Design a protein around this motif. Structure first.
Motif, PDB file in Angstrom:
ATOM      1  N   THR C   1       0.828  -1.198   0.000  1.00  0.00           N
ATOM      2  CA  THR C   1       0.000   0.000   0.000  1.00  0.00           C
ATOM      3  C   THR C   1       0.865   1.251   0.000  1.00  0.00           C
ATOM      4  O   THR C   1       1.793   1.372   0.800  1.00  0.00           O
ATOM      5  CB  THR C   1      -0.944   0.040   1.214  1.00  0.00           C
ATOM      6  OG1 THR C   1      -1.540  -1.249   1.397  1.00  0.00           O
ATOM      7  CG2 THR C   1      -2.040   1.073   1.004  1.00  0.00           C
ATOM      8  N   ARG C   2       0.550   2.174  -0.908  1.00  0.00           N
ATOM      9  CA  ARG C   2       1.267   3.437  -1.033  1.00  0.00           C
ATOM     10  C   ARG C   2       2.746   3.185  -1.310  1.00  0.00           C
ATOM     11  O   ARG C   2       3.111   2.795  -2.423  1.00  0.00           O
ATOM     12  CB  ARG C   2       1.070   4.294   0.219  1.00  0.00           C
ATOM     13  CG  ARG C   2      -0.302   4.951   0.272  1.00  0.00           C
ATOM     14  CD  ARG C   2      -0.434   6.065  -0.766  1.00  0.00           C
ATOM     15  NE  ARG C   2      -1.632   6.888  -0.610  1.00  0.00           N
ATOM     16  CZ  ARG C   2      -2.015   7.504   0.503  1.00  0.00           C
ATOM     17  NH1 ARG C   2      -1.270   7.501   1.594  1.00  0.00           N
ATOM     18  NH2 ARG C   2      -3.172   8.159   0.512  1.00  0.00           N
ATOM     19  N   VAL C  16       2.214   3.584   4.460  1.00  0.00           N
ATOM     20  CA  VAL C  16       1.169   4.584   4.629  1.00  0.00           C
ATOM     21  C   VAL C  16      -0.156   3.856   4.441  1.00  0.00           C
ATOM     22  O   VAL C  16      -0.557   3.549   3.315  1.00  0.00           O
ATOM     23  CB  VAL C  16       1.327   5.749   3.651  1.00  0.00           C
ATOM     24  CG1 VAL C  16       0.611   6.978   4.182  1.00  0.00           C
ATOM     25  CG2 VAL C  16       2.798   6.041   3.408  1.00  0.00           C
ATOM     26  N   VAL C  17      -0.834   3.568   5.549  1.00  0.00           N
ATOM     27  CA  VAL C  17      -2.093   2.835   5.492  1.00  0.00           C
ATOM     28  C   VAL C  17      -3.163   3.719   4.868  1.00  0.00           C
ATOM     29  O   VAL C  17      -3.354   4.874   5.273  1.00  0.00           O
ATOM     30  CB  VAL C  17      -2.500   2.357   6.893  1.00  0.00           C
ATOM     31  CG1 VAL C  17      -3.986   2.078   6.948  1.00  0.00           C
ATOM     32  CG2 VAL C  17      -1.717   1.116   7.270  1.00  0.00           C
ATOM     33  N   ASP C  18      -3.867   3.180   3.878  1.00  0.00           N
ATOM     34  CA  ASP C  18      -4.885   3.904   3.123  1.00  0.00           C
ATOM     35  C   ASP C  18      -6.182   3.101   3.194  1.00  0.00           C
ATOM     36  O   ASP C  18      -6.444   2.250   2.340  1.00  0.00           O
ATOM     37  CB  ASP C  18      -4.423   4.122   1.683  1.00  0.00           C
ATOM     38  CG  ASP C  18      -5.189   5.222   0.985  1.00  0.00           C
ATOM     39  OD1 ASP C  18      -5.037   6.398   1.376  1.00  0.00           O
ATOM     40  OD2 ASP C  18      -5.934   4.911   0.031  1.00  0.00           O
ATOM     41  N   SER C  39      -6.997   7.511   6.516  1.00  0.00           N
ATOM     42  CA  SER C  39      -5.586   7.358   6.197  1.00  0.00           C
ATOM     43  C   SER C  39      -4.792   7.156   7.480  1.00  0.00           C
ATOM     44  O   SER C  39      -5.285   7.387   8.587  1.00  0.00           O
ATOM     45  CB  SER C  39      -5.057   8.572   5.423  1.00  0.00           C
ATOM     46  OG  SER C  39      -5.788   8.766   4.226  1.00  0.00           O
ATOM     47  N   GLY C  40      -3.549   6.721   7.320  1.00  0.00           N
ATOM     48  CA  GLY C  40      -2.703   6.490   8.473  1.00  0.00           C
ATOM     49  C   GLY C  40      -1.337   5.997   8.055  1.00  0.00           C
ATOM     50  O   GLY C  40      -1.022   5.905   6.867  1.00  0.00           O
TER      51      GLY C  40
END
Lengths: 169, 167, 56, 78
Positions: C1-2, C16-18, C39-40
């Motif tokens: 992710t990302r 980057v958690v999406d 997001s995170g």
RNA sequence: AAACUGCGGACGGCUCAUUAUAACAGUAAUAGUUUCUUUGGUUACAAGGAUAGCUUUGUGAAUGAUAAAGAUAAUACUUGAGACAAUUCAUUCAAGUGAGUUAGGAUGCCACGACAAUUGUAGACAAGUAACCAAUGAGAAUUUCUGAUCUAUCAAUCAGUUGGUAGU
RNA sequence: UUCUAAGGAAGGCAGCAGGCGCGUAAAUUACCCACUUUCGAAUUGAAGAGGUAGUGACGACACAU
């Protein structure tokens, strides 16, 4: 009683102000004191303070006189009569009539422990252990680097320099 | 303490100079030490940045150099005979740079005997008179109040005539 | 992710958690206004010997 | 002889004895020291031939000439 | 743990009273000075005392108060082999730089004088120490040129004042 | 200005909170080193520097009826 001879070695005033050995008066004086003469313990380094002290002359105002040789106040008295021993090996030879070559570990002051075991003695210093030459573990040894391991470079380096300084053509 | 700043002076126009700050250690001076003549007495002074200056309060001996003979010898100082700045330095025998002093040419004479085989007691005439009279003229070239020693040289032809006529 | 950063120096992986709605540490999570997207940033501390060592 | 008008003996900053005709240091005389300053400035003949003594002259001393350079008109010479 | 020793409290934080070419801004110099830290280099099989925390006796209402005695360590204080460097002075041979009797070399002399008599069994490798070069350093400090508000019911001001020599 | 046993003793909030006074005129005697970074024998300890929280119609932006 019969009495012996003593020498005055200290004392305090009625107000707790100590007596300075150098000061040769009877009353109290205020001096600029460092830690050298004792009567003032500094906090910072190189910090002086104007403190009050007593002279070295005894008088009736004195409350306690350490005059030993005691701790007697002034009619009364009081009294003071190996916590750890020496540590250096050279000191061990001095106390037990030991020469330079004889072993001193057999004559190290050993103190027991009696609690809910162990026969304790200080950490020794300055003996003959094979790794005492850690002092030369190498530690000494390692003049090598210095000893031409480096120094010959300084003649390696030097020499080849004068070569391409002499081409100069 | 003694200060060396220019904030206490006047401007080139003669106008007074007002004050904004106080004294600071950067412009700090120290009390002069008038190096007299006598028993050896020197002191160590901590300067800025920890360096040490040898403050010579009193001295008797000194190292003096003979230019013509290319030698330098230690010698006892006898008298101070001429100071180009202040005459009060002459009476008090103050040792400073450029002070014409009188020293006994004993080591120099002995050196001449061992090297030429002769005794002095071409050279300029006044130099010979100093040798026979036991008092030769030398000029101090060190800063005794800073380096803590008297380093000088024996006066010679053109410098000797000028300084001898002054006396 | 990302994006991926492989960080063996800190013995760590970070992403980057999406979110389209013990070794795990999650920090800096905020949604978008009006719900939905969140997001995170995630913290992969792998072995449980870095997590303790490299963890306030 | 004419420059020795003070209480002290006037010498140059760099005073050295010349060599005589026989090739050895002649302590009976001193070389007249004179240097050349930098950015396109010629040394006046007086700094070479002349016998004056000055410890602040840029041509016959150790005072250097640094970056700033200006020009003007002499106002007073008293 | 406490204590000796080392480092730091000269940075950071607050305020604008002082201040009229003073300070500050741009600029230029230090061939007129220069530390600390960090970085690159260079130069006896081991000696001597005493001191704290420690023990003991205490004073004063009291301070971050202090007195005596008995011991005990050093990368604290000293001596000491390991073999030059840096200072002053006098004379002298002299190459980069816009420019230097200049960096540098030689001769003689004085003072100073080393690279812990150091530390890990474990995380030879380290680590530590004295001086001297150089960087850090367009840093710090002095200094050059130019630049400030109102006022002439402020028109003359200055005597270390302006310069010279020698010194401190 | 403060303590005092009356013999004596330390102290400098133009540091962060706070108090008196002054004036038309200006906020909590809070929590933490987790961010930035500094100091130290050092990866770990401190930091009213710094961060977070409380008061806040000084101001600035969007927006209800």
């Amino acid at each position: 009683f019969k009495g012996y001879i003593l020498k005055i070695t200290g004392g305090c005033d009625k107000d707790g102000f100590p007596m300075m050995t150098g000061v040769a008066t009877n009353n109290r004086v205020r001096l600029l004191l460092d830690g050298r003469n004792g009567c003032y313990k500094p906090l910072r380094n190189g910090e002086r303070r104007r403190k009050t002290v007593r002279g070295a002359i005894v008088a009736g105002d004195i409350s306690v006189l350490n005059t030993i040789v005691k701790g007697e106040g002034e009619i009364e008295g009081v009294t003071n009569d190996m916590r750890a021993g020496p540590k250096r090996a050279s000191h061990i030879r001095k106390l037990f009539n030991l020469s330079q070559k004889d072993d001193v570990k057999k004559f190290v002051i050993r103190r027991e422990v009696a609690k809910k075991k162990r026969s304790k003695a200080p950490k020794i210093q300055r003996l003959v252990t094979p790794r005492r030459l850690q002092h030369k573990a190498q530690k000494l040894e390692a003049k090598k680097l210095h000893k031409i391991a480096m120094l010959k470079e300084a003649k390696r380096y030097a020499a080849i320099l004068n070569r391409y300084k002499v081409l100069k053509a | 303490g003694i200060t060396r700043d220019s904030r206490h002076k006047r401007r080139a126009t003669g106008g007074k100079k007002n004050s904004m700050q106080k004294k600071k250690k950067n412009t700090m001076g120290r009390q002069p030490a008038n190096t007299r003549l006598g028993a050896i007495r020197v002191h160590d002074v901590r300067c800025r940045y920890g360096i040490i200056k040898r403050r010579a309060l009193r001295l008797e001996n000194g190292n003096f150099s003979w230019a013509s003979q290319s030698i330098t010898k230690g010698t006892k100082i006898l008298n101070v005979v001429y100071n180009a700045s202040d005459n009060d330095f002459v009476r008090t025998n103050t040792l400073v740079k450029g002070a014409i002093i009188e020293i006994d040419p004993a080591p120099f004479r002995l050196w001449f005997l061992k090297f030429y085989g002769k005794d002095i007691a071409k050279f300029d005439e006044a130099l010979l008179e100093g040798f026979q009279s036991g008092r030769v003229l030398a000029c101090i070239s060190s800063r005794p109040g800073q380096t803590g020693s008297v380093e000088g040289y024996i006066l010679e032809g053109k410098e000797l005539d000028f300084y001898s006529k002054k006396i | 992710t990302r994006n991926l950063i492989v960080n063996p120096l800190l013995c760590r992986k970070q992403v980057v958690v999406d979110i389209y709605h013990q070794t795990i540490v999650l920090n800096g999570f905020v949604t978008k206004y009006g719900g939905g997207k969140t997001s995170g940033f995630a913290l992969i501390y792998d072995t449980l010997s870095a997590l303790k060592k490299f963890v306030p | 002889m004419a420059e020795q008008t003070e209480r002290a003996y006037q010498k140059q900053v760099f005073h050295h004895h010349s060599r005589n005709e026989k090739g050895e240091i002649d302590f009976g005389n001193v070389k007249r020291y004179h240097k050349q300053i930098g950015m396109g400035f010629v040394t006046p003949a007086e700094a070479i031939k002349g016998t004056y003594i000055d410890k602040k002259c840029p041509f016959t001393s150790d005072v250097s000439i640094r970056g700033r350079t200006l020009s003007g008109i002499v106002k007073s010479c008293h």
